[PDB]
């Protein structure tokens, strides 16, 4: 039945009327499921017959899934809105997806420091280095924050590179000694981490349950917004630290065994409509991959350096690599050890 579409996307990553408008235009109903990690999506895909027509991996995982033959090539004649994509971004994405054959950029962002300034001051003292990775990777520092709660993503492939970076190593290093050093750094700060989770931190941060979350940029902006709408006195801020940060890029793609491919292509095309993509960015506060959409984004969002960064900040951002299996395996092993008491 080409009038039903099964989508699996990140949580907190669409506008509340996006699907209603898609169905209104197309008559295609959408069953929409959400995840908060690449690993969950990855396991589904690799096992095969996932039951989804559209999924949204990060670009690091997309590159690997493409080589593994997970996705079908997009029929670009069914995607007239392709013209709206930022061509410069599409060029950089060619490394992961030669000829941009399988996917389009949905949204992207950074992994940095979300925090509650009042709670940090009370716990830390005046002038906490809230604009620096030293805030959390210096044991004496995170120790002061243990009091109001510090979270990190449950995402080894995105968090261990922050440790690597902090130690002065390349964030895409495969060197076993550097990787191990990253693990040792985390073990030192681990007693002061309240939890590792990739979505729970939005509510906790908005509600005042924690005072620092190392998380996805747009997520922290949503927490800020929820806080403001709650009128419950919680102030949330986000910094891309002075030293730089990792940047992830999420990509829409179509599993080879998609039951409906025609509808999936319709959905992908619908997402490249300028006003549709801009409305999404307004709500979830991650920049998108659509040059035609930028002008239609609210100016407080488009003009915010934590969402659309300046050229100078861009130069300090790194991407997450297509990982060799041995590195992934080492990272997984470290992450199990780190998460556990």
Swiss-Prot record:
Give me the residues that bind putrescine, please.
11-12, 219, 250
Q: Kindly state which keywords UniProt assigns to this record, in alphabetical order.
A: Disulfide bond, Periplasm, Signal, Transport
Q: Name one GO biological process term.
A: polyamine transport
From the record, give the cysteines joined by S-S bonds: 148-211
Q: What results from gene inactivation?
A: No change in type 3 secretion system (T3SS) induction.
State the compartments where it is located.
Periplasm
Predominant cellular place of this UniProt entry's protein: periplasm
**Xref: SUPFAM superfamilies:** Periplasmic binding protein-like II
Q: Name one GO molecular function term.
A: putrescine binding
Pfam families, A to Z: SBP_bac_8
Q: Which GO terms describe its cellular component?
A: periplasmic space
Q: Does the keyword Phosphoprotein apply?
A: no
- Function as written in the Swiss-Prot or TrEMBL entry: Putrescine-binding protein probably required for putrescine uptake into cells. Binds putrescine with high affinity (KD=3 nM), spermidine with relatively low affinity (KD=6.8 uM). Does not bind cadaverine or spermine. Putrescine binding induces large inter-domain conformational changes.
Protein family membership: Belongs to the bacterial solute-binding protein PotD/PotF family.
PANTHER family on file:
NORSPERMIDINE SENSOR, SPERMIDINE/PUTRESCINE-BINDING PERIPLASMIC PROTEIN
What name goes with this protein?
Answer: Putrescine-binding periplasmic protein SpuD
State the organism named in the record: Pseudomonas aeruginosa (strain ATCC 15692 / DSM 22644 / CIP 104116 / JCM 14847 / LMG 12228 / 1C / PRS 101 / PAO1)
Biological classification of the source? Bacteria, Pseudomonadati, Pseudomonadota, Gammaproteobacteria, Pseudomonadales
């Amino acid at each position: 039945d080409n009038k039903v579409l099964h989508v699996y996307n990140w949580s907190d990553y669409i506008a509340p009327d996006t699907l209603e408008k898609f169905t209104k235009e197309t008559g295609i109903k959408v069953v929409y499921d959400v995840y908060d990690s690449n690993e969950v999506l990855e396991a589904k895909l690799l096992a095969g017959k996932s039951g989804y027509d559209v999924v949204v991996p990060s670009n690091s995982f997309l590159a690997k899934q493409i080589k593994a033959g997970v996705y079908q090539k997009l029929d670009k004649s069914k995607l007239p809105n392709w013209k709206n994509l930022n061509k410069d971004l599409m060029h950089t994405l060619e490394v992961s997806d030669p000829g941009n054959e399988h996917a389009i950029p949905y949204m992207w962002g950074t992994i940095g420091i979300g925090y509650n300034p009042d709670k940090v001051k009370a716990a830390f003292g005046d002038n906490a280095p809230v604009d620096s990775w030293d805030l959390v990777f210096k044991p004496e520092n995170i120790q002061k924050l243990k009091q109001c709660g510090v979270s990190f993503l449950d995402s080894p492939t995105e968090i261990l590179p922050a440790a690597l970076h902090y130690l002065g190593y390349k964030p895409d290093t495969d060197n076993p000694k550097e990787l191990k050093a990253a693990e040792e750094l985390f073990l030192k700060i681990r007693p002061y981490v309240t939890y590792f989770h990739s979505s729970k931190y939005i509510s906790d941060l908005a509600n005042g349950n924690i005072c620092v979350a190392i998380g996805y940029s747009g997520d922290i902006y949503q927490a800020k917004s929820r806080a403001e709408e709650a009128k419950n006195k919680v102030t949330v801020k986000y910094n891309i630290p002075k030293e730089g940060a990792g940047s992830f890029f999420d990509m829409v793609a179509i599993p080879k065994d998609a039951e409906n491919t025609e509808g999936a292509l319709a959905f992908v095309n619908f997402l490249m409509k300028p006003e549709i993509m801009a409305e999404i960015t307004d709500v979830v506060q991650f920049p998108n991959g659509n040059a035609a959409a930028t002008p239609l984004v609210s100016e407080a969002i488009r003009n915010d350096p934590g969402i659309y960064p300046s050229e100078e900040v861009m130069k300090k951002l790194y991407t997450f690599p297509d990982l060799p299996a041995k590195t992934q395996r080492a990272m997984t092993r470290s992450w199990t050890k780190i998460k556990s008491g």
